[PDB]
Amino acid sequence: MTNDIYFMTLAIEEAKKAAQLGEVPIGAIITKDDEVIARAHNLRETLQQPTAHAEHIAIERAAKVLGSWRLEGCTLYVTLEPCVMCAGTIVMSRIPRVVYGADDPKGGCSGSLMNLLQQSNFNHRAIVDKGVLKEACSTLLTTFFKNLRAN
Amino acid sequence: MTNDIYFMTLAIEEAKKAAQLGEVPIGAIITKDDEVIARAHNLRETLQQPTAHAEHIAIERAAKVLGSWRLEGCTLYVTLEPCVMCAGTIVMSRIPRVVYGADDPKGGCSGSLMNLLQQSNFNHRAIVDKGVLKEACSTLLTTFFKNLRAN
RNA sequence: UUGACUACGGAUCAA
RNA sequence: UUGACUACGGAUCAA
Ligand SMILES: [Zn+2]
Ligand SMILES: [Zn+2]
């Protein structure tokens, strides 16, 4: 029983809310000192905003809470591997650590298609840990799309 | 080309607004049907939001007016080559064409360090044109950082 | 520590 | 068209 696992379950809770809203089931949690400072879930379809991915929303919420665009000492937990946009957002908010669940072989940019969080040419790189509760994180997606298609 | 200068002119004017606020002088304009539907300038320091880059703000404003996260038929004009975050946001909002002024040798991800807008593995790619009013776009930055250091 | 720097220069980079 | 698909499946990909 670890914090990483604990916080990921909280991210899965966010992913479930998204599923209840009819959105792709992806959730995110941001911590500082092992204290939740922000949480979010996918709201792209609900708000019709291209940036409404879970990580992106969480990052802006944490920035407001901390009073600065620099999220120093923060850790981001997300159920799915960050896409090109979120990976870049992580770089620009300078989050030092990212823990994610399932990999995204189709659009993942934190290890799959590329790792934008580990670029020597960027002014910031982040520690990247994957697999945390990936089975459960992955199940939410496959279930969602199964139903999406059936319907 | 002349149309491009017209809109980049408005992006520079927007960039100057950011300058007056003490922000890195970058501005953006989004058009649809040859009409301006959104404009914005850098607000990172003012709002203390890591996502407050000009094109990112313009994209969310564009999405709001269109009531859709898909920016079909839109053209983005920005005074500086989009960074990793903005390039990714451009991909996630599915903008068909991007026109930028000055190149960013240090962080540009639309041709310089890489081109996230021409990724074979992504579900979206855009036409990228560079150099429009390159000189004017570049000067703003050169001046900003010269004064910043002296400051 | 000095220098460089095109998204602050609180980052990064070179000695 | 027809299928596949892990950020809608309005995209992309494959025949
Ligand atoms: Zn994302
Ligand atoms: Zn940017």
CSV table of all heavy atoms in Angstrom, one decimal, chain D:
chain,number,residue,atom,x,y,z
D,1,U,O5',-19.9,4.8,-48.4
D,1,U,C5',-19.8,3.8,-47.4
D,1,U,C4',-19.4,2.5,-48.2
D,1,U,O4',-18.3,2.7,-49.0
D,1,U,C3',-19.1,1.3,-47.3
D,1,U,O3',-20.2,0.6,-46.8
D,1,U,C2',-18.2,0.4,-48.2
D,1,U,O2',-19.0,-0.4,-49.1
D,1,U,C1',-17.5,1.5,-49.0
D,1,U,N1,-16.2,1.8,-48.4
D,1,U,C2,-15.1,0.9,-48.7
D,1,U,O2,-15.3,-0.1,-49.4
D,1,U,N3,-13.9,1.3,-48.1
D,1,U,C4,-13.7,2.4,-47.4
D,1,U,O4,-12.5,2.6,-46.9
D,1,U,C5,-14.8,3.3,-47.1
D,1,U,C6,-16.0,2.9,-47.7
D,2,U,P,-20.3,0.2,-45.3
D,2,U,OP1,-21.6,-0.6,-45.1
D,2,U,OP2,-20.1,1.3,-44.4
D,2,U,O5',-19.2,-0.9,-45.1
D,2,U,C5',-19.2,-2.1,-45.8
D,2,U,C4',-17.9,-2.9,-45.6
D,2,U,O4',-16.8,-2.1,-46.2
D,2,U,C3',-17.5,-3.0,-44.1
D,2,U,O3',-18.2,-4.1,-43.5
D,2,U,C2',-16.0,-3.2,-44.2
D,2,U,O2',-15.6,-4.5,-44.5
D,2,U,C1',-15.6,-2.3,-45.4
D,2,U,N1,-15.2,-0.9,-45.0
D,2,U,C2,-13.9,-0.8,-44.7
D,2,U,O2,-13.1,-1.7,-44.7
D,2,U,N3,-13.5,0.5,-44.3
D,2,U,C4,-14.3,1.6,-44.3
D,2,U,O4,-13.9,2.7,-44.0
D,2,U,C5,-15.7,1.3,-44.6
D,2,U,C6,-16.1,0.1,-44.9
D,3,G,P,-18.3,-4.1,-41.9
D,3,G,OP1,-19.5,-5.0,-41.6
D,3,G,OP2,-18.3,-2.7,-41.4
D,3,G,O5',-17.0,-4.8,-41.4
D,3,G,C5',-16.4,-4.5,-40.2
D,3,G,C4',-14.9,-4.6,-40.3
D,3,G,O4',-14.4,-3.8,-41.4
D,3,G,C3',-14.1,-4.1,-39.1
D,3,G,O3',-14.1,-5.1,-38.0
D,3,G,C2',-12.8,-3.8,-39.7
D,3,G,O2',-12.0,-5.0,-39.8
D,3,G,C1',-13.1,-3.3,-41.0
D,3,G,N9,-13.3,-1.8,-41.1
D,3,G,C8,-14.4,-1.1,-41.3
D,3,G,N7,-14.2,0.2,-41.4
D,3,G,C5,-12.9,0.3,-41.1
D,3,G,C6,-12.1,1.5,-41.0
D,3,G,O6,-12.4,2.7,-41.1
D,3,G,N1,-10.7,1.2,-40.7
D,3,G,C2,-10.2,-0.1,-40.6
D,3,G,N2,-8.9,-0.2,-40.3
D,3,G,N3,-11.0,-1.2,-40.7
D,3,G,C4,-12.3,-0.9,-40.9
D,4,A,P,-14.2,-4.6,-36.5
D,4,A,OP1,-14.5,-5.8,-35.7
D,4,A,OP2,-15.2,-3.5,-36.5
D,4,A,O5',-12.8,-4.0,-36.2
D,4,A,C5',-11.7,-4.9,-36.3
D,4,A,C4',-10.4,-4.0,-36.2
D,4,A,O4',-10.3,-3.1,-37.3
D,4,A,C3',-10.3,-3.1,-35.0
D,4,A,O3',-9.9,-3.8,-33.8
D,4,A,C2',-9.3,-2.1,-35.4
D,4,A,O2',-8.0,-2.5,-35.3
D,4,A,C1',-9.7,-1.9,-36.9
D,4,A,N9,-10.6,-0.8,-37.1
D,4,A,C8,-12.0,-0.9,-37.3
D,4,A,N7,-12.5,0.3,-37.5
D,4,A,C5,-11.4,1.2,-37.4
D,4,A,C6,-11.3,2.6,-37.6
D,4,A,N6,-12.4,3.4,-37.8
D,4,A,N1,-10.1,3.2,-37.5
D,4,A,C2,-9.1,2.4,-37.2
D,4,A,N3,-9.0,1.0,-37.1
D,4,A,C4,-10.2,0.5,-37.2
D,5,C,P,-10.5,-3.4,-32.4
D,5,C,OP1,-9.9,-4.3,-31.4
D,5,C,OP2,-11.9,-3.2,-32.5
D,5,C,O5',-9.8,-2.0,-32.1
D,5,C,C5',-8.4,-1.8,-32.1
D,5,C,C4',-8.0,-0.4,-32.1
D,5,C,O4',-8.4,0.2,-33.3
D,5,C,C3',-8.6,0.5,-31.0
D,5,C,O3',-7.8,0.4,-29.8
D,5,C,C2',-8.5,1.9,-31.7
D,5,C,O2',-7.2,2.4,-31.5
D,5,C,C1',-8.8,1.6,-33.1
D,5,C,N1,-10.2,1.7,-33.5
D,5,C,C2,-10.6,3.0,-34.0
D,5,C,O2,-9.8,3.9,-34.0
D,5,C,N3,-11.9,3.2,-34.3
D,5,C,C4,-12.7,2.1,-34.2
D,5,C,N4,-14.0,2.3,-34.6
D,5,C,C5,-12.3,0.9,-33.8
D,5,C,C6,-11.1,0.7,-33.4
D,6,U,P,-8.6,0.3,-28.4
D,6,U,OP1,-7.9,-0.8,-27.6
D,6,U,OP2,-10.1,0.1,-28.7
D,6,U,O5',-8.4,1.7,-27.7
D,6,U,C5',-9.1,2.8,-28.0
D,6,U,C4',-8.4,4.1,-27.6
D,6,U,O4',-8.0,3.9,-26.2
D,6,U,C3',-7.1,4.2,-28.4
D,6,U,O3',-6.7,5.5,-28.8
D,6,U,C2',-6.0,3.5,-27.5
D,6,U,O2',-4.8,4.2,-27.6
D,6,U,C1',-6.6,3.8,-26.1
D,6,U,N1,-6.2,2.9,-25.0
D,6,U,C2,-5.0,3.2,-24.4
D,6,U,O2,-4.3,4.2,-24.7
D,6,U,N3,-4.6,2.3,-23.4
D,6,U,C4,-5.2,1.2,-23.0
D,6,U,O4,-4.7,0.5,-22.1
D,6,U,C5,-6.5,0.9,-23.7
D,6,U,C6,-6.9,1.7,-24.7
D,7,A,N1,-7.8,13.3,-20.8
D,7,A,C2,-8.9,13.1,-21.6
D,7,A,N3,-8.9,12.4,-22.7
D,7,A,C4,-7.7,11.9,-23.1
D,7,A,C5,-6.5,12.1,-22.4
D,7,A,C6,-6.6,12.8,-21.2
D,7,A,N7,-5.5,11.5,-23.0
D,7,A,C8,-6.0,10.9,-24.1
D,7,A,N9,-7.3,11.1,-24.2
D,7,A,C1',-8.3,10.7,-25.2
D,7,A,C2',-8.0,11.1,-26.6
D,7,A,O2',-8.2,12.4,-26.9
D,7,A,C3',-9.0,10.1,-27.4
D,7,A,O3',-10.3,10.6,-27.4
D,7,A,C4',-8.9,8.8,-26.5
D,7,A,O4',-8.5,9.3,-25.2
D,7,A,C5',-7.9,7.9,-27.0
D,7,A,O5',-8.5,7.0,-28.0
D,7,A,P,-7.7,6.6,-29.3
D,7,A,OP1,-8.7,5.9,-30.2
D,7,A,OP2,-6.9,7.7,-29.8
D,8,C,P,-10.8,11.7,-28.4
D,8,C,OP1,-9.8,11.7,-29.5
D,8,C,OP2,-11.0,12.9,-27.6
D,8,C,O5',-12.2,11.1,-28.9
D,8,C,C5',-12.3,10.0,-29.8
D,8,C,C4',-13.5,10.2,-30.7
D,8,C,O4',-14.7,9.7,-30.0
D,8,C,C3',-13.8,11.7,-31.0
D,8,C,O3',-14.1,12.0,-32.3
D,8,C,C2',-14.9,12.1,-30.0
D,8,C,O2',-15.8,13.0,-30.6
D,8,C,C1',-15.6,10.7,-29.9
D,8,C,N1,-16.5,10.5,-28.7
D,8,C,C2,-17.8,10.1,-29.0
D,8,C,O2,-18.1,9.8,-30.2
D,8,C,N3,-18.7,9.9,-28.0
D,8,C,C4,-18.3,10.2,-26.7
D,8,C,N4,-19.2,10.1,-25.8
D,8,C,C5,-17.0,10.6,-26.4
D,8,C,C6,-16.1,10.7,-27.4
D,9,G,P,-13.2,11.5,-33.5
D,9,G,OP1,-12.0,10.8,-33.0
D,9,G,OP2,-13.0,12.7,-34.4
D,9,G,O5',-14.1,10.5,-34.3
D,9,G,C5',-14.0,9.1,-34.1
D,9,G,C4',-15.3,8.3,-34.5
D,9,G,O4',-15.1,6.9,-34.3
D,9,G,C3',-16.4,8.7,-33.6
D,9,G,O3',-17.7,8.8,-34.3
D,9,G,C2',-16.5,7.6,-32.5
D,9,G,O2',-17.8,7.1,-32.2
D,9,G,C1',-15.8,6.4,-33.2
D,9,G,N9,-14.9,5.5,-32.5
D,9,G,C8,-15.2,4.2,-32.2
D,9,G,N7,-14.2,3.6,-31.6
D,9,G,C5,-13.2,4.6,-31.5
D,9,G,C6,-11.9,4.5,-30.9
D,9,G,O6,-11.3,3.5,-30.4
D,9,G,N1,-11.2,5.7,-31.1
D,9,G,C2,-11.7,6.8,-31.6
D,9,G,N2,-10.9,7.9,-31.7
D,9,G,N3,-13.0,6.9,-32.1
D,9,G,C4,-13.6,5.8,-32.0
D,10,G,P,-18.4,10.2,-34.5
D,10,G,OP1,-18.4,10.9,-33.2
D,10,G,OP2,-19.8,9.8,-35.0
D,10,G,O5',-17.6,10.9,-35.6
D,10,G,C5',-17.8,10.6,-37.0
D,10,G,C4',-17.1,11.5,-37.9
D,10,G,O4',-17.6,12.9,-37.7
D,10,G,C3',-15.6,11.7,-37.5
D,10,G,O3',-14.6,11.0,-38.2
D,10,G,C2',-15.5,12.9,-36.6
D,10,G,O2',-14.3,13.7,-36.9
D,10,G,C1',-16.7,13.7,-37.0
D,10,G,N9,-17.4,14.4,-36.0
D,10,G,C8,-18.1,13.9,-34.9
D,10,G,N7,-18.7,14.7,-34.1
D,10,G,C5,-18.4,16.0,-34.7
D,10,G,C6,-18.8,17.3,-34.4
D,10,G,O6,-19.5,17.6,-33.4
D,10,G,N1,-18.3,18.2,-35.2
D,10,G,C2,-17.5,17.9,-36.4
D,10,G,N2,-17.1,19.0,-37.1
D,10,G,N3,-17.2,16.7,-36.7
D,10,G,C4,-17.6,15.8,-35.9
D,11,A,P,-14.1,11.6,-39.6
D,11,A,OP1,-14.9,12.8,-39.9
D,11,A,OP2,-14.0,10.5,-40.6
D,11,A,O5',-12.6,12.0,-39.3
D,11,A,C5',-12.2,13.4,-39.0
D,11,A,C4',-10.9,13.4,-38.2
D,11,A,O4',-11.2,12.9,-36.9
D,11,A,C3',-9.8,12.5,-38.8
D,11,A,O3',-9.1,13.1,-39.9
D,11,A,C2',-9.0,12.3,-37.6
D,11,A,O2',-8.2,13.4,-37.2
D,11,A,C1',-10.0,12.1,-36.5
D,11,A,N9,-10.5,10.7,-36.3
D,11,A,C8,-11.6,10.2,-36.8
D,11,A,N7,-11.7,8.9,-36.5
D,11,A,C5,-10.5,8.6,-35.9
D,11,A,C6,-10.0,7.4,-35.3
D,11,A,N6,-10.7,6.2,-35.3
D,11,A,N1,-8.8,7.5,-34.7
D,11,A,C2,-8.2,8.6,-34.6
D,11,A,N3,-8.6,9.8,-35.1
D,11,A,C4,-9.8,9.7,-35.7
D,12,U,P,-8.7,12.2,-41.1
D,12,U,OP1,-7.8,13.0,-42.0
D,12,U,OP2,-9.9,11.5,-41.6
D,12,U,O5',-7.7,11.1,-40.5
D,12,U,C5',-6.4,11.5,-39.9
D,12,U,C4',-5.8,10.4,-39.2
D,12,U,O4',-6.7,9.9,-38.1
D,12,U,C3',-5.5,9.1,-40.0
D,12,U,O3',-4.3,9.2,-40.7
D,12,U,C2',-5.4,8.1,-38.9
D,12,U,O2',-4.2,8.1,-38.2
D,12,U,C1',-6.5,8.5,-37.9
D,12,U,N1,-7.8,7.9,-38.3
D,12,U,C2,-8.0,6.6,-37.8
D,12,U,O2,-7.2,6.0,-37.1
D,12,U,N3,-9.3,6.1,-38.1
D,12,U,C4,-10.3,6.7,-38.8
D,12,U,O4,-11.3,6.1,-39.0
D,12,U,C5,-10.0,8.0,-39.3
D,12,U,C6,-8.8,8.6,-39.0
D,13,C,P,-4.1,8.4,-42.1
D,13,C,OP1,-2.7,8.8,-42.6
D,13,C,OP2,-5.3,8.6,-42.9
D,13,C,O5',-4.1,6.9,-41.6
D,13,C,C5',-3.0,6.4,-40.7
D,13,C,C4',-3.3,5.0,-40.4
D,13,C,O4',-4.5,4.9,-39.6
D,13,C,C3',-3.6,4.0,-41.5
D,13,C,O3',-2.3,3.6,-42.1
D,13,C,C2',-4.3,2.9,-40.8
D,13,C,O2',-3.5,2.1,-40.1
D,13,C,C1',-5.2,3.7,-39.9
D,13,C,N1,-6.5,4.0,-40.4
D,13,C,C2,-7.5,3.1,-40.3
D,13,C,O2,-7.3,2.0,-39.7
D,13,C,N3,-8.8,3.4,-40.7
D,13,C,C4,-9.0,4.5,-41.3
D,13,C,N4,-10.3,4.8,-41.7
D,13,C,C5,-8.0,5.5,-41.4
D,13,C,C6,-6.8,5.2,-41.0
D,14,A,P,-2.4,2.9,-43.6
D,14,A,OP1,-1.0,2.6,-43.9
D,14,A,OP2,-3.1,3.9,-44.5
D,14,A,O5',-3.2,1.6,-43.4
D,14,A,C5',-2.7,0.5,-42.7
D,14,A,C4',-3.6,-0.7,-42.8
D,14,A,O4',-4.9,-0.4,-42.1
D,14,A,C3',-4.0,-1.0,-44.2
D,14,A,O3',-3.0,-1.8,-44.8
D,14,A,C2',-5.3,-1.7,-44.1
D,14,A,O2',-5.2,-3.1,-43.7
D,14,A,C1',-6.0,-1.0,-42.9
D,14,A,N9,-6.9,0.1,-43.3
D,14,A,C8,-6.6,1.4,-43.5
D,14,A,N7,-7.6,2.2,-43.8
D,14,A,C5,-8.7,1.3,-43.8
D,14,A,C6,-10.0,1.5,-44.0
D,14,A,N6,-10.6,2.6,-44.2
D,14,A,N1,-10.8,0.4,-43.9
D,14,A,C2,-10.3,-0.8,-43.6
D,14,A,N3,-9.0,-1.1,-43.4
D,14,A,C4,-8.2,0.0,-43.5
D,15,A,P,-3.0,-2.1,-46.4
D,15,A,OP1,-1.6,-2.3,-46.8
D,15,A,OP2,-3.8,-1.1,-47.1
D,15,A,O5',-3.8,-3.5,-46.5
D,15,A,C5',-4.4,-3.9,-47.8
D,15,A,C4',-5.8,-4.5,-47.5
D,15,A,O4',-6.4,-3.7,-46.5
D,15,A,C3',-6.7,-4.4,-48.7
D,15,A,O3',-6.5,-5.5,-49.7
D,15,A,C2',-8.1,-4.5,-48.1
D,15,A,O2',-8.5,-5.8,-47.7
D,15,A,C1',-7.8,-3.6,-46.8
D,15,A,N9,-8.1,-2.2,-47.0
D,15,A,C8,-7.1,-1.2,-47.1
D,15,A,N7,-7.7,0.0,-47.2
D,15,A,C5,-9.0,-0.2,-47.2
D,15,A,C6,-10.1,0.7,-47.3
D,15,A,N6,-10.0,2.0,-47.4
D,15,A,N1,-11.4,0.1,-47.2
D,15,A,C2,-11.5,-1.2,-47.1
D,15,A,N3,-10.5,-2.1,-47.0
D,15,A,C4,-9.3,-1.6,-47.1
